[PDB]
Amino acid sequence: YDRGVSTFSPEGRLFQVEYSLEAIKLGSTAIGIATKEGVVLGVEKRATSPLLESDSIEKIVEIDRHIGCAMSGLTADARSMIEHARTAAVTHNLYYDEDINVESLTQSVCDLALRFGEGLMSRPFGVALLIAGHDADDGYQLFHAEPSGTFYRYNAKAIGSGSEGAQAELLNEWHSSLTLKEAELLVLKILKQVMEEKLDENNAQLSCITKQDGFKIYDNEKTAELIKELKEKEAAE
Amino acid sequence: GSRRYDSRTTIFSPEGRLYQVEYALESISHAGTAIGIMASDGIVLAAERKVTSTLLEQDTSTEKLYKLNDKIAVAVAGLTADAEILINTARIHAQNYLKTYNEDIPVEILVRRLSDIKQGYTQHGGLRPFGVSFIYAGYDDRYGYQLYTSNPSGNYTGWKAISVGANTSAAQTLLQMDYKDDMKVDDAIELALKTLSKTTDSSALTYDRLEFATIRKEVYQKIFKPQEIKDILVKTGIT
Amino acid sequence: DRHITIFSPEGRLYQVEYAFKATNQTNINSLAVRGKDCTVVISQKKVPDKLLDPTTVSYIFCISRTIGMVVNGPIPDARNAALRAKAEAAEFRYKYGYDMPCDVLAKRMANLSQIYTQRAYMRPLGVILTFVSVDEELGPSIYKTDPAGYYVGYKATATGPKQQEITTNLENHFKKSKIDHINEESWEKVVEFAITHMIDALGTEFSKNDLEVGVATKDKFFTLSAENIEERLVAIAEQ
Amino acid sequence: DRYSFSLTTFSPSGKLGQIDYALTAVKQGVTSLGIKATNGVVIATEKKSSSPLAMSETLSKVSLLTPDIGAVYSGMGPDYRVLVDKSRKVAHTSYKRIYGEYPPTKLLVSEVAKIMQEATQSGGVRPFGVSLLIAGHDEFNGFSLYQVDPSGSYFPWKATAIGKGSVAAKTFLEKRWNDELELEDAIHIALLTLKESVEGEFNGDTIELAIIGDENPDLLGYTGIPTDKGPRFRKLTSQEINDRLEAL
Amino acid sequence: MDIILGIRVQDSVILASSKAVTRGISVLKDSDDKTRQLSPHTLMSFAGEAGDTVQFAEYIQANIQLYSIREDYELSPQAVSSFVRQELAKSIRSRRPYQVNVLIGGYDKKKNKPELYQIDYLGTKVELPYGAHGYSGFYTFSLLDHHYRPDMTTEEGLDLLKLCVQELEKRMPMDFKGVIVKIVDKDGIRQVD
Amino acid sequence: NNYDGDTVTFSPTGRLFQVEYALEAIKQGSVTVGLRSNTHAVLVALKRNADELSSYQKKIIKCDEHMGLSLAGLAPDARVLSNYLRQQCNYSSLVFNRKLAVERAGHLLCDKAQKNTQSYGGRPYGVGLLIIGYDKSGAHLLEFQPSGNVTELYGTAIGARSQGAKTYLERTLDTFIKIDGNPDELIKAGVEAISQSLRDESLTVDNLSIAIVGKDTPFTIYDGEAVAKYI
Amino acid sequence: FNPYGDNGGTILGIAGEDFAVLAGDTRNITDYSINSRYEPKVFDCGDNIVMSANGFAADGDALVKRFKNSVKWYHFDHNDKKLSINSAARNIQHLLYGKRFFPYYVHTIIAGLDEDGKGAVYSFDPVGSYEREQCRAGGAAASLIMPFLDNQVNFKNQYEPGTNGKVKKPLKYLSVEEVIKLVRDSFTSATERHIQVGDGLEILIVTKDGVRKEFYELKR
Amino acid sequence: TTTLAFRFQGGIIVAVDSRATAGNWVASQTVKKVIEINPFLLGTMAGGAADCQFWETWLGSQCRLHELREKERISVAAASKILSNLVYQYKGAGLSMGTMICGYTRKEGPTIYYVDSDGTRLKGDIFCVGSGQTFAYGVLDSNYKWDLSVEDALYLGKRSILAAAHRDAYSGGSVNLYHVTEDGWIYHGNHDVGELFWKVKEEEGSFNNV
Amino acid sequence: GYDRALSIFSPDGHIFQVEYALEAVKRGTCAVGVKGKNCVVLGCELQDTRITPSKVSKIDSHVVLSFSGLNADSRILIEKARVEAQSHRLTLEDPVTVEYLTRYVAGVQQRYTQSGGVRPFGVSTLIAGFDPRDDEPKLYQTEPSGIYSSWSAQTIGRNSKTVREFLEKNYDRKEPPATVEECVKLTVRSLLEVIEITVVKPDSDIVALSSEEINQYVTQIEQEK
Numbered sequence A: 001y002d003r004g005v006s007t008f009s010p011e012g013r014l015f016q017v018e019y020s021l022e023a024i025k026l027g028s029t030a031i032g033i034a035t036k037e038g039v040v041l042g043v044e045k046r047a048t049s050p051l052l053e054s055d056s057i058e059k060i061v062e063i064d065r066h067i068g069c070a071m072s073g074l075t076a077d078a079r080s081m082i083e084h085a086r087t088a089a090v091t092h093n094l095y096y097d098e099d100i101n102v103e104s105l106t107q108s109v110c111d112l113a114l115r116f117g118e119g120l121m122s123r124p125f126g127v128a129l130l131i132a133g134h135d136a137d138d139g140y141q142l143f144h145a146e147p148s149g150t151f152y153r154y155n156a157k158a159i160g161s162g163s164e165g166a167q168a169e170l171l172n173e174w175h176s177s178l179t180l181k182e183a184e185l186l187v188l189k190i191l192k193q194v195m196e197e198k199l200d201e202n203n204a205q206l207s208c209i210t211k212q213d214g215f216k217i218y219d220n221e222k223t224a225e226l227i228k229e230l231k232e233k234e235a236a237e
Numbered sequence B: 001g002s003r004r005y006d007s008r009t010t011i012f013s014p015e016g017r018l019y020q021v022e023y024a025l026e027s028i029s030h031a032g033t034a035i036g037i038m039a040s041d042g043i044v045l046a047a048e049r050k051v052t053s054t055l056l057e058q059d060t061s062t063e064k065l066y067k068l069n070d071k072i073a074v075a076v077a078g079l080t081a082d083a084e085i086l087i088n089t090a091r092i093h094a095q096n097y098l099k100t101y102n103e104d105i106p107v108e109i110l111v112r113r114l115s116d117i118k119q120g121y122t123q124h125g126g127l128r129p130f131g132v133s134f135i136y137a138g139y140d141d142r143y144g145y146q147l148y149t150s151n152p153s154g155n156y157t158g159w160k161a162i163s164v165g166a167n168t169s170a171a172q173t174l175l176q177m178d179y180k181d182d183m184k185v186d187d188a189i190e191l192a193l194k195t196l197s198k199t200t201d202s203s204a205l206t207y208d209r210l211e212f213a214t215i216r217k218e219v220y221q222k223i224f225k226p227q228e229i230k231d232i233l234v235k236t237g238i239t
Numbered sequence C: 001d002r003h004i005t006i007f008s009p010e011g012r013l014y015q016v017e018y019a020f021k022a023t024n025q026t027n028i029n030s031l032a033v034r035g036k037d038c039t040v041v042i043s044q045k046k047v048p049d050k051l052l053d054p055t056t057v058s059y060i061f062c063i064s065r066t067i068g069m070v071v072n073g074p075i076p077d078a079r080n081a082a083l084r085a086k087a088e089a090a091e092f093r094y095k096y097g098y099d100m101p102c103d104v105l106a107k108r109m110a111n112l113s114q115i116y117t118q119r120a121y122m123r124p125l126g127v128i129l130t131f132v133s134v135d136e137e138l139g140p141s142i143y144k145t146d147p148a149g150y151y152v153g154y155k156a157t158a159t160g161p162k163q164q165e166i167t168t169n170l171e172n173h174f175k176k177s178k179i180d181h182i183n184e185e186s187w188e189k190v191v192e193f194a195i196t197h198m199i200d201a202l203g204t205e206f207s208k209n210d211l212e213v214g215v216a217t218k219d220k221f222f223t224l225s226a227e228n229i230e231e232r233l234v235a236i237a238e239q
Numbered sequence D: 001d002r003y004s005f006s007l008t009t010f011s012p013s014g015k016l017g018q019i020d021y022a023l024t025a026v027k028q029g030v031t032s033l034g035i036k037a038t039n040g041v042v043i044a045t046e047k048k049s050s051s052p053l054a055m056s057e058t059l060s061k062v063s064l065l066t067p068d069i070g071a072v073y074s075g076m077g078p079d080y081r082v083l084v085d086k087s088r089k090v091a092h093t094s095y096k097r098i099y100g101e102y103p104p105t106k107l108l109v110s111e112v113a114k115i116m117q118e119a120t121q122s123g124g125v126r127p128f129g130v131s132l133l134i135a136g137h138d139e140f141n142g143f144s145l146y147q148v149d150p151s152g153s154y155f156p157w158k159a160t161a162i163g164k165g166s167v168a169a170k171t172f173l174e175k176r177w178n179d180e181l182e183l184e185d186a187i188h189i190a191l192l193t194l195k196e197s198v199e200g201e202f203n204g205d206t207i208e209l210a211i212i213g214d215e216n217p218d219l220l221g222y223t224g225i226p227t228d229k230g231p232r233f234r235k236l237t238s239q240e241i242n243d244r245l246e247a248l
Numbered sequence E: 001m002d003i004i005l006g007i008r009v010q011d012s013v014i015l016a017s018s019k020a021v022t023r024g025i026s027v028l029k030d031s032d033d034k035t036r037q038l039s040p041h042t043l044m045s046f047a048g049e050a051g052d053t054v055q056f057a058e059y060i061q062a063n064i065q066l067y068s069i070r071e072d073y074e075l076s077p078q079a080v081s082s083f084v085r086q087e088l089a090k091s092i093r094s095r096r097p098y099q100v101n102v103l104i105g106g107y108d109k110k111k112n113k114p115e116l117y118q119i120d121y122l123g124t125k126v127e128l129p130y131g132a133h134g135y136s137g138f139y140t141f142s143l144l145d146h147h148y149r150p151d152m153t154t155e156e157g158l159d160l161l162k163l164c165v166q167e168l169e170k171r172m173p174m175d176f177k178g179v180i181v182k183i184v185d186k187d188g189i190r191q192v193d
Numbered sequence F: 001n002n003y004d005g006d007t008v009t010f011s012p013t014g015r016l017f018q019v020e021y022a023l024e025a026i027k028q029g030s031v032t033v034g035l036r037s038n039t040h041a042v043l044v045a046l047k048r049n050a051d052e053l054s055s056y057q058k059k060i061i062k063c064d065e066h067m068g069l070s071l072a073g074l075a076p077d078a079r080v081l082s083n084y085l086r087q088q089c090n091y092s093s094l095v096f097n098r099k100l101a102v103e104r105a106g107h108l109l110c111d112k113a114q115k116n117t118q119s120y121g122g123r124p125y126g127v128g129l130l131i132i133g134y135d136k137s138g139a140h141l142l143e144f145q146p147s148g149n150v151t152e153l154y155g156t157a158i159g160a161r162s163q164g165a166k167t168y169l170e171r172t173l174d175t176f177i178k179i180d181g182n183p184d185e186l187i188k189a190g191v192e193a194i195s196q197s198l199r200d201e202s203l204t205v206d207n208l209s210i211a212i213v214g215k216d217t218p219f220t221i222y223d224g225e226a227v228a229k230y231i
Numbered sequence G: 001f002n003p004y005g006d007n008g009g010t011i012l013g014i015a016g017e018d019f020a021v022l023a024g025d026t027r028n029i030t031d032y033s034i035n036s037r038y039e040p041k042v043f044d045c046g047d048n049i050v051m052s053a054n055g056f057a058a059d060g061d062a063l064v065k066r067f068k069n070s071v072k073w074y075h076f077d078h079n080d081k082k083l084s085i086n087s088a089a090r091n092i093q094h095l096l097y098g099k100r101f102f103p104y105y106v107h108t109i110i111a112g113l114d115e116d117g118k119g120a121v122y123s124f125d126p127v128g129s130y131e132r133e134q135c136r137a138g139g140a141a142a143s144l145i146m147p148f149l150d151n152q153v154n155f156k157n158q159y160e161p162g163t164n165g166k167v168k169k170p171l172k173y174l175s176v177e178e179v180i181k182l183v184r185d186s187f188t189s190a191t192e193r194h195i196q197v198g199d200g201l202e203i204l205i206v207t208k209d210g211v212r213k214e215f216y217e218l219k220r
Numbered sequence H: 001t002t003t004l005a006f007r008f009q010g011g012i013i014v015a016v017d018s019r020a021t022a023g024n025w026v027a028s029q030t031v032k033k034v035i036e037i038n039p040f041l042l043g044t045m046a047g048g049a050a051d052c053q054f055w056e057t058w059l060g061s062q063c064r065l066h067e068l069r070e071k072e073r074i075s076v077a078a079a080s081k082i083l084s085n086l087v088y089q090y091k092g093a094g095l096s097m098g099t100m101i102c103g104y105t106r107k108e109g110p111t112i113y114y115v116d117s118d119g120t121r122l123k124g125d126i127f128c129v130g131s132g133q134t135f136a137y138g139v140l141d142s143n144y145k146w147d148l149s150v151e152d153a154l155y156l157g158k159r160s161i162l163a164a165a166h167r168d169a170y171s172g173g174s175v176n177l178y179h180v181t182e183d184g185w186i187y188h189g190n191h192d193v194g195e196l197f198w199k200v201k202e203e204e205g206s207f208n209n210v
Numbered sequence I: 001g002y003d004r005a006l007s008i009f010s011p012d013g014h015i016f017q018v019e020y021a022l023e024a025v026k027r028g029t030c031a032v033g034v035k036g037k038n039c040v041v042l043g044c045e046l047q048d049t050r051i052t053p054s055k056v057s058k059i060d061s062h063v064v065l066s067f068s069g070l071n072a073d074s075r076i077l078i079e080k081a082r083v084e085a086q087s088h089r090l091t092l093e094d095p096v097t098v099e100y101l102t103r104y105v106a107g108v109q110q111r112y113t114q115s116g117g118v119r120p121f122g123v124s125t126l127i128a129g130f131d132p133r134d135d136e137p138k139l140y141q142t143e144p145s146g147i148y149s150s151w152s153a154q155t156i157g158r159n160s161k162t163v164r165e166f167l168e169k170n171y172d173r174k175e176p177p178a179t180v181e182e183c184v185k186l187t188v189r190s191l192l193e194v195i196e197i198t199v200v201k202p203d204s205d206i207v208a209l210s211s212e213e214i215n216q217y218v219t220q221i222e223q224e225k
Helices: A015-024 A075-096 A102-113 A163-173 A180-194 A220-233 B019-028 B080-101 B107-123 B168-178 B185-199 B226-235 C014-022 C075-096 C102-118 C163-177 C187-202 C226-238 D017-027 D077-099 D105-118 D166-176 D183-195 D238-246 E052-071 E077-093 E136-147 E154-171 F017-028 F075-096 F102-118 F162-176 F183-195 G057-076 G085-097 G142-153 G176-193 H049-070 H076-089 H133-143 H150-167 H193-203 I016-027 I071-091 I098-111 I160-170 I180-192 I211-224
Strands: A030-035 A038-044 A060-064 A067-073 A127-135 A139-145 A151-154 A156-159 A204-210 A214-217 B034-038 B042-048 B065-067 B072-078 B132-140 B144-150 B156-159 B161-164 B210-216 B220-223 C030-034 C038-044 C060-062 C068-072 C128-135 C139-145 C151-154 C156-159 C211-217 C221-223 D032-037 D040-046 D063-066 D069-075 D130-138 D142-148 D154-156 D159-162 D207-212 D233-235 E004-008 E013-018 E021-023 E026-029 E035-039 E042-048 E100-108 E113-119 E125-127 E130-132 E179-185 E188-192 F032-036 F040-046 F060-064 F067-073 F127-135 F138-144 F150-152 F155-158 F208-214 F217-223 G010-015 G020-025 G028-030 G033-036 G042-044 G050-055 G106-113 G119-124 G130-133 G135-139 G200-207 G210-217 H003-008 H011-017 H020-022 H025-028 H034-038 H041-044 H098-105 H109-116 H121-123 H126-129 H174-181 H184-192 I031-035 I040-044 I057-060 I063-069 I123-129 I138-142 I148-150 I153-156 I196-201 I205-208
Touching (some): A030 A067, A030 A127, A030 A163, A030 A180, A038 A180, A060 A075, A075 A102, A075 A127, A075 G085, A075 I098, A127 A204, A156 A163, A180 A204, A180 A220, A204 A220, B019 B072, B034 B072, B034 B168, B034 B185, B042 B132, B072 B080, B080 B132, B080 D105, B107 B132, B107 B156, B107 I071, B132 B161, B161 B168, B185 B210, B185 B226, C030 C187, C038 C128, C038 C139, C060 C075, C060 C211, C060 C221, C068 C211, C075 C102, C102 C151, C128 C156, C139 C156, C163 C187, C187 C211, C187 C226, D032 D130, D040 D069, D040 D142, D040 D183, D063 D077, D063 D130, D069 D077, D069 D207, D130 D159, D159 D166, D166 D183, E004 E042, E004 E113, E042 E077, E042 E179, E052 E077, E052 I071, E077 E100, E077 E113, E130 E136, E154 E179, F017 F127, F032 F162, F040 F138, F040 F183, F067 F208, F067 F217, F102 F150, F127 F155, F127 F208, F183 F208, G010 G050, G010 G106, G010 G119, G010 G176, G020 G042, G020 G106, G020 G119, G020 G176, G119 G135, H041 H049, H098 H126, H098 H174, H126 H133, H150 H174, H150 H193, H174 H193, H184 H193, I016 I123, I031 I063, I031 I123, I040 I123, I063 I071, I063 I098, I071 I123, I098 I123, I098 I138, I160 I180, I180 I211
Antiparallel strands (some): A060 A067, A067 A127, A127 A139, A204 A214, B034 B042, B034 B161, B132 B144, B144 B156, B210 B220, C030 C156, C211 C221, D032 D040, D069 D130, D142 D154, D207 D233, E021 E026, E100 E113, E113 E125, F032 F040, F067 F127, F138 F150, G010 G135, G020 G200, G028 G033, G106 G119, G119 G130, H098 H109, I031 I040, I040 I196, I057 I063, I123 I138, I196 I205
């Protein structure tokens, strides 16, 4: 409170952005894997009590038919960002009669992030987004959108508290020839590794984007089938 | 900039308390005791005057008790200037309601609106809260006689008998001891004056140190003239 | 409390006191006296830098046709006050159809100063303003305004580090003369008086470059050129 | 203006520190007093000169607010001057322009108290460092004397004093005041009470005194409307004060 | 134009409203209900400019419902008609007035009395034993002035309404496609024939 | 340091520490080289990736076919300033049907940046820009610093280790300024300059991007296999 | 004050199977005076989109300027991605309707290739309603031009000669050269019979190869 | 112009003409007077073309935002009220609109709302709008049934538009037919009114005056 | 106006004002919710009872809000929620869903964590009800951060850790209480693990239980223990 929210550190970094990044390290893990067949998103549904209905958590959301988002950190902050993104995508379709590109949408969200100060929101968002989508120009794309208002495209990315281990495994195990089924099982493998809870269809959620049918979240039954398949195949790894 | 000088009213303490509200409440704990009692047939308001001198016009000083409309009165503890601001707002609100609906404002609607004004200053705008607690005495055809209190937080609660200001723990103890639901206004007048007499930190309770009002059955709303306070003090055996 | 115009526990406004200190930054003394139908202002001019254009160095301002102002304090705040006073006087003449009186302008500028004493976001101006005119109703008039927003009329006044020495000499002169004004019919002798008295008080002779002189008459306020001041100084040498 | 926040706040003890400090400024001010008689009100103050060269006649410590309401102050003179201007305007805009009538004393006092209260709570302002004595007459309430403090609290008085001498003055006024006091007696007592608190020199130049009294049709400035009352406010001349002091 | 009629009898208020909606050359609809229930015992019927009537009535309905939720209480028909009058009186001074004439029929369960208020688009409110807007009164008031009795039962009120409607159908040149009839009483609001 | 809390505070020596810290943002940014001849101006930028799985962040933004820039430091501020510059060029074209001079564009950025140094509540921009363009006065290169200082140069470099490239450009100025017929040799001069700022890293078709503008050469960005010629 | 005027001029869009034509006369008029004999109304807006906004020429100029600026901004924020003719049509609708209550008093036509590579023509009312059309004429002599093109391009009202009105004359491919010939003859007849129809005909032709411009002199 | 929609057991038929006119001049024969708001909602353009097209496309955008927020198809009632509120906010500004919002949801079934520039919002079984509406009503009221076949309902729509095209000079060009089902709307193609006229004139034997 | 950034990140990335708003919730009087198969039951443990009504506020005829924390802040949220419910019912043609209202209230709380010059609400809410043509009961919680989630049973305020551990022992996620009596018995048992009860049922059937009924449950529980 001594220091104004817009100030640089002597190291040339905005204090409130850095501290927002510290908030995101506390968030539950989200993992994205891009493939030529589709993008997979998976999230740790870190239920705080068994009386919590895990199906209400909804840490993966549709932004448009071919764009989805996974969030980690202060997930209440994400609802504003997602409202903006959805409005941008629909407004783009209204003004151009065409879908927004995934990159242009990610930029629209990242343009929101540093619009904080005094004399505007009071603080940065405390949430990172994995934005996955398809467009005809650049295909299946995964982006990491950060409260710095910067974004990178990623082949695969982990965010949240598990991110450093998961990302090391993504560096090991991602390759351009991964099928979507392989990406699904790799997401589940790395969630299982970095999740403290036992992975099951209630502790985790999956989704993919495919151009044939767009963004869909997988039902618990399909996810349990995939977790069974992983448990089987893990005998040979 | 100015950030250096901003005391940041409207922030939580680590315990989740609003310190300016707690400190305004402390301010009110040094104000003159006010008492409300809801009888079966009416309501008594009584208050102690803290400022006293032989040179004060007690006959024209009316600092504790105010009419809000023909059916509702307030007793004030705390900063009288802040109270006068809020009382004017409440009077306007009551008349706006009568203009809109052609009916007298329900007591709870008035109390809620004034409490919401007080709450606003605790949550936004960076201003200090109003340093006043109110007792509201009113009648309406829905609930009849109603006695409310409100404080700087904008909390409000309904009461059968209530005290605000300095000696309220003692006053509420004595009221718990002697209150009865069947009691008449003339019983409640005695209970009010006896409680003020037993709680005042002066040497003796006297008509110059008192303000007194009643709402009783239409409903009539009487602020006692000082001679009537003499009459009631002798009738109660306190003077 | 030291940094903004809020009360100290002693009820002081330290920023106002420190704004008074700023009024002596220039180390200049000014003197004003009333004649029968003129007012004269004398101010020291100190132009030590040979590269200055001395004609641009002035603390005397023509506010209107009839009002002069002399400022003690740093020239930027002086020019702020002068511009504001000029605007106020023109606006007064437009609104009300007659020339702004010197006392009315002094009141208005003092009220602006009070605002700076009361609102935290504006600092006081570090200037003392002495307004002079021959008023249509009050005759020759000296009104002096300060950073507190105080103003009063004066028989005569001085301002600056040596204002006590000049003031006590003026007071002794009025004790010697038993009058509220300089008894002379024409302003040249009032100028010569004021210069002689500043010399006697400060203990220093003046060249025509060491002074600036303002004269208010019924028709106009005007400032003397250096050669008119020469004529007055040689008159003093010969009278 | 970035000072949108309150500069007056509650301390942990519940004090509004800036208001107590404004009251300290008042208590260091030059003594002012008021006395209500059956048939008038006196308000009086010392005029302390800032210089022997100052024309104290040019500084009005007693001000007409309405033809029947006068004020005096102790404390910060400039704050008083600005409050007088605001009181005059609000007496017009909040009342005379609506009802065709000057406000009663109590309602104008309420309006002044409101202005003072807002300086204790609105953003970026300190309280006014003045206490006012406001004397007036109105047809229904008669003569009134009120004190308004920096908080905007106000109290009706039979007699009171404010400023540095107010304790001794209030004790003397408690000795001297009574319900049968006529305005000439109130003026005499006022002059006595100031004599005991002036810094030596005590005369019609060092004293400012005004009364609320009878209507003064000679001050009205026109004739032919029998219902138009002359002003009840009247500042005494220095010669009237001297004449009374010689007989004191 | 639309017909709205009201009769306050001893125990109840009867409101009758025409079913036609006409745009230009054609009858679009023959079944339109020109009323909104404001509260369980208060009904408002409306007539006037297309669009204005329903926008106004739904705004009123939402505000009365909000009041009822906030207070957990039902406003009297008096208070409702005062509120509606205030909204109409504002609209006359607004940049686009609601051209809407209303009848408010309610049963005051505190008084146990039926109440019928007529409010014109100006905000002229009048409590009446029976009421109408526009030309419907020109044909019906002589029947009501002749036959109306304050102690009428609901059934007598309905028969008198039938006579008024028959007279309108005879002499009024428009075809208004009959009326919907609502009854407001101590049991609430019901629709009748 | 009590004086670094805001832009509106001078230190006792007249420094503006928040501005200096925003320049440290630039010094942490990856190197960009600019250089020009009389006929052509070139930008060369080393992009950085977040990790082996990430893309390389865009360092170069086209304003117009006559103008574009390269950024070092806080990329969202570069987006803001690039949009503003695009608006100014657009306004000049719409209202006067004239191509905005590069010098005037630079002064417009200077003025926009200065406001954030002078008033409370904002902050300085955290980004340095190299602006190249071609106009009626020929090729231009500007360096923008978020102090609001804009300087016209034949060559410069900004970002980390950029003093090595700047030293090389200082050493070779009298050669590269003459390269008027041959944009590819000016590009190669710029790529050799930026090589002097590389530490434990090599230029690749992934991390290198180039832009050029000139007499009949609309502002064009080369990236990917388009730069393999110049590596 | 009337903020509008009529500058005459006539324009014609024809979509071919693999080309589009947008043609306009070049005369600018005010009442019975010629302002200019060669003030072109048909513009290449980039992305192989051609546009003409016939009517009040100040509003037409303003709309074309704003559309070109929208194209530039689309390039800036889509990495010089080509704007589709369909997206351009939607954007032009939004440009026009933003002035709904003080409209651009122009009939606009744009022409280009769709993403299949077929000729596309879109026509817009002053307020921004728009339709993809095979052909549209606009302006003063549209009524003189289009019925003849309906007859010669679409064989409207023409039946197969031996069938006594049973069988339509079958539609067939017109080359761009045949279309240009029909356009020239239509504008020549309009020049004969409409006093506003200009001194010259400028034809923009859009193909996969880009935009090409042809000019033909008209009478006067 | 002529537009109609009617409810039946198969859902909704929407039938429209394609004529546009400017005075006596036929500006186009091929105007699309149905706006495909989304795969489940249709609107009919009969006012000013620009107002209907623009605001019903925007309505489609609002439906999509509602679906994203609420995870459900928007109601036809909700869509028509969104449109009628928008149009009422511009009342007196001079919007020119007269549209049937047609849709079929599980909660509502097949639903038509007439919406007007004046802010009228009417639910109904049958609406005809435009200069030919009285002729279309004349056929439709003579021949409508709820139990009508889908093919019979499409024929009835086509014949009502044809009747308007014969009698109303400002109606004609071609007939566009739509069938709204719970699964969405089905386009049943374009029918040139001249071909249709001479077909019906021979097959049905009507228009004996011609 | 006043725009001070009151809610800001600490170096460890916490927002202290939201944590302290949660401390205000934790000091606040309890609220308990238990969702059954066909009802949701809400409960709580010289005042005039008539004009100190239930803490359980109707937002609309089908949906009900309880809260813990600052009562005055809760009045602001309740009024906003009621206004939004009526607005949705007006501008669209249906009453709000319970999740729509919950999301609106959580959005209001979130916005006051990220807006200049405002304190976060020191309030947590339980939102219970039925969607207008649905009979799946709903029970949502909102928090000062603007997080919201659905619960089978939940408690907020003073004793809520202990009561939640009790509900976790005694609520069966695969055999939820089958009748109103079972829901009420579980709610009362949880509140006695340390009375006012509202039952919410479909079709706007919201009923506060009589004290004599509650005392029947209380005495039965005290007889079975």
